[PDB]
A paper describes a structure:
To elucidate the structural mechanism of c-di-AMP binding we obtained the [name] [name]-c-di-AMP structure to 2.45 Å resolution. The structure revealed no density for c-di-AMP in the inducer binding pocket, but density for a di-adenine nucleotide was observed near the four-helix bundle module of [name], with the nucleotide making contacts to both subunits of the dimer. The density for the adenine moieties was well resolved while the density for the phosphate groups was less clear. Hence, a di-adenine nucleotide was fitted to the map. In the structure, the dinucleotide is wedged within the long loop between helices α8 and α9 of one [name] subunit and also contacts residues from the N-terminus of α8´ from the other subunit. In this interaction, only one of the adenine bases is bound within each pocket and the other adenine base is solvent exposed. Each of the exposed adenine bases inserts into the binding pocket of an adjacent [name] dimer, leading to [name] polymer contacts in the crystal. In addition to Gln184 and Arg179 both adenine moieties are contacted by the side chains of Trp177, Tyr178, Ile181 and Leu192 from one [name] subunit and Asp159 Leu162 and Arg165 from the other subunit. As noted, the density for the phosphates are weak and indeed, there are no phosphate contacts from [name].
Residue numbers in the entry:
A (entry chain C), B (entry chain A): 10 to 207
The structure:
């Protein structure tokens, strides 16, 4: 509900000014409320970080998991999973940064165990997500619709390639859903299809 | 000669701790020297970061540029350039981090003309490095060794994929130069040839 509004503006502020130099007041300014309502909804600043991670990891999974069991060859579901994964990134950049800057928070010596208890639990959520891609890649290797490559290395490589889109992608003012979807499909075409000729 | 020892130490400390959480103190401990030694060869912590960036650009360009004019189709030279880039990434991991940590020292206080001038200067070195790959990609497309894709999108996609090896790759001690070369060849096979079959 109205936490969703806080999670977005928190993720975006987390992405722009950094977790370290963003404060609960800064989210209060962005969300247009007082320091009260934020602290009503999450325990602490690190709780919003955890919540954006958790929510953003749920967003990408509800969008990608439906294709794991769908019909089609392995390559065909992998393509659909990837376009979804890239499209999630370009639409929800703030969530994507907090998810993959959960190490930027790890850069400071891991302080609270009862927090590194939830952050590690969250890491397992990202682990499970990547397992979906490993499963389809394995299936696509066996059904011939992918190359006989190393299943582990191809999974690491592909997922890092999908998350690397944020290196050069910017939110263009006025890009439509269709345009973003099409650009994600262009990107996935180079990732799955390669750039060399055959 | 000996400055290189401080550059090695700052690159790795900037990688693990992060730029902000490393001080001139730790670099001195890490080289086995006093703070005064570092303040000899560099005015400021940022100027070290500047020197690590500059040495990171020189190392990778020296390793990769020879393959630009080597014999081969555009694909063959793109492959050779890319392996050397990834080899340099795996071998000089701290330097690579700093060369692309730059995004984190751009969002921070862009403050001094004497320094921000030099930081933007390094980004043109980087931009000019990334133009070497763009030019080879354009040739590879024109000579049929690469699929007829968007040469600008493929350049951004490829370079970000090559630089994303650092998501999952860790220096494993005892790993030889040959093993790094083999692993980098494996990665580049996937970036150039895709995972898709047929």
């Amino acid at each position: 509900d109205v936490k969703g509004r806080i999670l977005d503006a928190a993720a975006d502020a987390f992405m722009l000014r950094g977790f370290a130099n963003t404060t609960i007041d800064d989210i209060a300014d962005d969300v247009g409320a007082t320091k009260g309502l934020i602290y009503y909804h999450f325990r602490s600043k690190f709780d919003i970080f955890l919540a954006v991670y958790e929510d953003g990891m749920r967003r990408v999974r509800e969008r990608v998991e439906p294709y794991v069991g769908a019909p089609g060859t392995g390559r065909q579901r992998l393509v659909a999973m990837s376009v979804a994964h890239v499209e999630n990134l370009m639409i929800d950049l703030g969530y994507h940064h907090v998810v993959h800057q959960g190490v930027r928070d790890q850069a400071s010596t891991a302080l609270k165990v009862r927090q590194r208890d939830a952050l590690a639990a969250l890491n397992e959520l990202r682990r499970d997500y990547e397992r979906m891609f490993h499963h389809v890649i394995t299936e696509g290797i066996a059904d011939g619709s992918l190359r006989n490559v190393d299943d582990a290395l191809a999974t690491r490589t592909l997922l890092s390639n999908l998350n690397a889109v944020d290196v050069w992608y910017r939110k263009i003012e006025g890009q439509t859903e269709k345009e973003v979807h099409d650009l994600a499909s262009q990107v996935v075409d180079l990732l799955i299809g390669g750039i060399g000729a055959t």
